[PDB]
Each structure stands twice: as C-alpha cells, then as structure tokens.
C-alpha cells in the first residue's frame, strides 16, 4: 500500500481543521477550537488506489513540512488577508523543500457564505501563476472536500510520474 503525507496550511480560522475533520470523520465542527498540531490517518480509495493519507492540520511541524508530499494551501473566500498570505506559505514550502515544483492545491474555503471578498477570478489567476489546481470548498456543506484532497494526491502522482 502507498502512503501520502499531506500538510494543510493557511491562515487562522480559514477552515483547515473543519476540512480535515470532514474528510476523516464525515461531520462539520461548528465551533472554533484552536489547533496546535493535529495529525490524522485514514484509509481511502482514490481513483482505485488504496492509499493511506497521513494528514497534518497545522495552526494559523518541520518534520511534516520536510516529509510532506503535497500541501493544501487554504484561504477563506471571506478573508482577503488569508488569500494574501498564500504567497507567504508557498514561499516557505518551496524553502523547506528547495524545489520550484512542489505538489500543491489552492483551496478557497467557506464558499457557502455570502460575504465574499476574494473572487473566483482572483484565485484562478493566482493558481494559474503557480501552476496548481484551484478548488472551491465548503466544510459546512462538504462541497469539494473530497475533490480538494483527491486532487492533491493526483498532483503527487503526477510529480512522482
Ligand atoms: N460557514 C462556514 N464556516 C466554516 C467553514 N469551514 C470552517 N468554518 C468555521 O470557521 C471557524 C474556524 O474553522 P477551523 O476549522 O477551526 O479553522 P482553522 O483553519 O483550523 N483555524 P486555526 O488555524 O486557528 O487552527 C469555525 O467556527 C468553523 O465552524 C466553511 O466551509 N463554512
Ligand atoms: Mg485548526
């Protein structure tokens, strides 16, 4: 069996824990519990490949940062600053990995909310510059939660080629 080490990064409160908890335990946590360094493991079938997902839910670990094979760079569509911080998280990932091509996926969370300040056009333009997919998600309605994590694994498969 193949293991995939995934790291979820992003500014505080964008929904990193809610996205991971939806993927692992299939429910939406409505309360805001401040995360330190939560880890998770889960057996799933992705495109027919049985694989283990080792997921670190970082706070807004250098071990997971060095061992991480793919990175979910998450922002909230109602949080302009979190979208701006994406550049800083990507630079740190490229720094600790010393690679200009690191498997990443850009996630715009909280797309169920009507208080948007980051347009879909902005995020797709940013993702186009990075050469990474962009997924709109809602941990509340579970929209795009599977697609976000599964697309990251496909990006890892493409990188391992
Ligand atoms: N409406 C809505 N609320 C969401 C969504 N995702 C998370 N939230 C809410 O936003 C708050 C923060 O979510 P959380 O998962 O804790 O964010 P975080 O990125 O893990 N925070 P931290 O970096 O401090 O650990 C919670 O109240 C949660 O219910 C979403 O898709 N839609
Ligand atoms: Mg958290």
Swiss-Prot record:
Its EC number(s): 3.6.5.2
Q: What is the effect of changing residue 58 to I?
A: In NS3; affects activity and impairs responsiveness to GTPase activating proteins; exhibits only minor alterations in its in vitro biochemical behavior compared to wild-type protein
Catalyzed reaction equations:
GTP + H2O = GDP + phosphate + H(+)
Describe what happens upon changing residue 14 to I.
Answer: In NS3; affects activity and impairs responsiveness to GTPase activating proteins; characterized by a strong increase of both intrinsic and guanine nucleotide exchanged factor-catalyzed nucleotide exchange leading to an increased level of the activated state
Q: What is the effect of changing residue 12 to S?
A: In GASC and JMML; also found in lung carcinoma; somatic mutation
Q: Do you know which InterPro entries this protein is assigned to?
A: P-loop_NTPase, Small_GTP-bd, Small_GTPase, Small_GTPase_Ras-type
Substituting residue 12 to R results in: In lung cancer and bladder cancer; somatic mutation
Noted disease association is: Leukemia, acute myelogenous: A subtype of acute leukemia, a cancer of the white blood cells. AML is a malignant disease of bone marrow characterized by maturational arrest of hematopoietic precursors at an early stage of development. Clonal expansion of myeloid blasts occurs in bone marrow, blood, and other tissue. Myelogenous leukemias develop from changes in cells that normally produce neutrophils, basophils, eosinophils and monocytes. Leukemia, juvenile myelomonocytic: An aggressive pediatric myelodysplastic syndrome/myeloproliferative disorder characterized by malignant transformation in the hematopoietic stem cell compartment with proliferation of differentiated progeny. Patients have splenomegaly, enlarged lymph nodes, rashes, and hemorrhages.
Report disulfide bridges, numbered on this chain. Answer: none
Q: Give the organism, scientific name.
A: Homo sapiens (Human)
What biological-process terms (Gene Ontology) are attached? actin cytoskeleton organization; cardiac muscle cell proliferation; cytokine-mediated signaling pathway; epithelial tube branching involved in lung morphogenesis; female pregnancy; forebrain astrocyte development; gene expression; glial cell proliferation
User: Which gene produces this protein?
Assistant: KRAS
Q: Name the UniProt key words of this record, in alphabetical order.
A: Acetylation, Cardiomyopathy, Cell membrane, Cytoplasm, Deafness, Disease variant, Ectodermal dysplasia, Glycoprotein, GTP-binding, Hydrolase, Intellectual disability, Isopeptide bond, Lipoprotein, Membrane, Methylation, Nucleotide-binding, Palmitate, Prenylation, Proto-oncogene, Ubl conjugation
What family is it from?
A: Belongs to the small GTPase superfamily. Ras family.
Q: What name has this protein been given in UniProt?
A: GTPase KRas
Q: How does it sit in the membrane?
A: Lipid-anchor
The record's listing under Gene3D superfamilies reads: P-loop containing nucleotide triphosphate hydrolases
Which function does this protein serve? Ras proteins bind GDP/GTP and possess intrinsic GTPase activity. Plays an important role in the regulation of cell proliferation. Plays a role in promoting oncogenic events by inducing transcriptional silencing of tumor suppressor genes (TSGs) in colorectal cancer (CRC) cells in a ZNF304-dependent manner.
Please name the GO terms that the record assigns under molecular function: G protein activity; GDP binding; GMP binding; GTP binding; GTPase activity; identical protein binding; LRR domain binding; protein-containing complex binding
Residues annotated as carrying N-acetylmethionine in the record are 1
Query: Chief localization class?
Result: membrane
What's known about how it's activated or inhibited? Alternates between an inactive form bound to GDP and an active form bound to GTP. Activated by a guanine nucleotide-exchange factor (GEF) and inactivated by a GTPase-activating protein (GAP). Interaction with SOS1 promotes exchange of bound GDP to GTP.
Keyword Transcription regulation tagged: no
The listed location of motif Effector region is 32-40
Q: Which residues carry this modification: N-acetylthreonine?
A: 2
Fetch the PROSITE patterns from UniProt. Answer: RAS
């Amino acid at each position: 069996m193949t293991e995939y080490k995934l790291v979820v990064v992003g500014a505080g409160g964008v929904g990193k824990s809610a996205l991971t908890i939806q993927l692992i335990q299939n429910h939406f946590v409505d309360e805001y519990d401040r995360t330190i360094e939560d880890s998770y493991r889960k057996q799933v079938v992705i495109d027919g490949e049985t694989c283990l997902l080792d997921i670190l839910d970082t706070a807004g670990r250098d071990q997971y940062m060095r061992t991480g094979e793919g990175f979910l760079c998450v922002f909230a569509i109602n949080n302009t600053k979190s979208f701006e911080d994406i550049h800083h998280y990507r630079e740190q990932i490229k720094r600790v990995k010393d690679s200009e091509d690191v498997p990443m996926v850009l996630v715009g969370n909280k797309c169920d909310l009507p208080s948007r300040t980051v347009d879909t056009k902005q995020a797709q333009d940013l993702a186009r510059s990075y050469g990474i997919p962009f997924i709109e998600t809602s941990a509340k309605t579970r929209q795009g939660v599977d697609d976000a994590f599964y697309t990251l694994v496909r990006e890892i498969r493409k990188h391992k080629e």
